[PDB]
Amino acid sequence: QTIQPGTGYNNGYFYSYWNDGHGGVTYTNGPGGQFSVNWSNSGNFVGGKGWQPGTKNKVINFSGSYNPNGNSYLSVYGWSRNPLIEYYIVENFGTYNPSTGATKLGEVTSDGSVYDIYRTQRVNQPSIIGTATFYQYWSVRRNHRSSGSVNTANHFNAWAQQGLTLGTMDYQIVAVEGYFSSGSASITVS
């Protein structure tokens, strides 16, 4: 069903939906691992389905339609504690590459494409533990797709070779993020 921002479990899967209160976004939880997001001249938002807690070796499958009309990303998104890390394994994006301004650390081949690895630090930003300072890890896919399988272990291993050391895994979802744009998406996770 269509809901306001919040988290919980739906049809067997953890979900998380958040927005900056700007308006223009409609998040709906669907059957099984499906969720749909329709937005128009929105603010900043993030919505998706997955697991709580996630793992370091989960193979995530997703399929559906992703039609961004501007700034938006489709990715495996999550957090880690001790160390506190926010991460993204970007599979597709609209008009703006999310790694713009980040520091490239290397590359990794996984699930049919090379991914460029980046890192950025967020100082005194909101997080799963409140206002804190943490790193943000990125894996950006060169060959964009809206359907496939992501072997998280390949990315976590690659990041570990570059100095990352994920601790306790918090949530892990396939999320659609929008930033003052429009679009529609219907993704099913499994």
Q: Report the catalytic residues.
A: 86, 177
Query: Does the annotation place 122 within a ligand binding site?
Result: yes
Whole-angstrom Cα distance, residue 5 to residue 131? Answer: 19
**62 Cβ contact partners less than 8 Å away, ≥ 6 residues apart:** 91, 147, 148, 149, 150, 174, 187, 188, 189, 190
Whole-angstrom Cα distance, residue 77 to residue 94? Answer: 17
Whole-angstrom Cα distance, residue 64 to residue 92? Answer: 12
Query: Does the annotation place 137 within a ligand binding site?
Result: no
Residue 100 identity: T
Query: Does the annotation place 17 within a ligand binding site?
Result: no
Query: Does the annotation place 136 within a ligand binding site?
Result: yes
Cβ-contact 133, 126 below 8 angstroms: no
Query: Does the annotation place 77 within a ligand binding site?
Result: yes
Query: Does the annotation place 98 within a ligand binding site?
Result: no
Binding residues: 73, 77, 88, 122, 126, 136, 171
Known binding-site residues for substrate equal 73, 77, 88, 122, 126, 136, 171
